[PDB]
Amino acid sequence: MALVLLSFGVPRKAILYPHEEPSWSLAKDIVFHPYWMIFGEVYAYEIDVCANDSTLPTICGPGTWLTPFLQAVYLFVQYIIMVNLLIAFFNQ
């Protein structure tokens, strides 16, 4: 689950924030939102950052259209496969 998380969190932060010097925030921002997705928070108005109803209209730029596709795959794997695999373990 933590691997699937970084599989998603690192490409997202890299696509959306491409002018980042090294910082401790980079360690927070690759775990924070991907973790709250596990609990069904999809951050609906932040997925497409070039949409008109975006809450993040300023990080629109090249490649950012990739992040919906990424998150669609992430949640299917994380929210459906991996959480219910853990539940299946707990059921046993």
Ligand X SMILES: CCCCCCCC/C=C/CCCCCCCC(=O)O[C@@H](COC(=O)CCCCCCCCCCCCCCC)COP(=O)([O-])OCC[N+](C)(C)C
Ligand Y SMILES: C[C@@H]1CC[C@@]2(OC1)O[C@H]1C[C@H]3[C@@H]4CC=C5C[C@@H](OCCC(CO)CO)CC[C@]5(C)[C@H]4CC[C@]3(C)[C@H]1[C@@H]2C
Instruction: Using alpha carbons, list the distances in angstroms from residue 92 to 9, 67, 86.
Output: 31, 36, 10
**Residue at 79: amino acid letter:** Y
Applying CB under 6 A, which part among 19-27, 50-58, 65-73, 75-83 lies near ligand Y? 19-27
Question: Which of its own copies, ligand Y, ligand X, none is residue 88 near (CB under 5 to 8 Å by kind)?
Answer: its own copies
Question: Which of its own copies, ligand X, ligand Y, none is residue 14 near (CB under 5 to 8 Å by kind)?
Answer: none
- Is 14 a binding residue for ligand Y by CB under 6 A? The answer is no
Q: What is the DSSP letter of 45?
A: T
Sites for its own copies among residues 28-57 (CB under 8 A): 32, 35-36, 39-44, 47-48, 53, 55
Residue nearest to Ca ion (CB): 40
Residue 28, classified by CB atoms within 10 Å of its CB into exposed (0-12), middle (13-18) or buried (19+), is exposed
Question: Which of ligand X, ligand Y, its own copies, none is residue 26 near (CB under 5 to 8 Å by kind)?
Answer: ligand Y
Question: Token pair for residue 75?
Answer: 């949640």
Instruction: Answer whether 47's CB lies under 8 Å from 57's CB.
Output: no
Binding site for Ca ion (CB under 5 A): 40
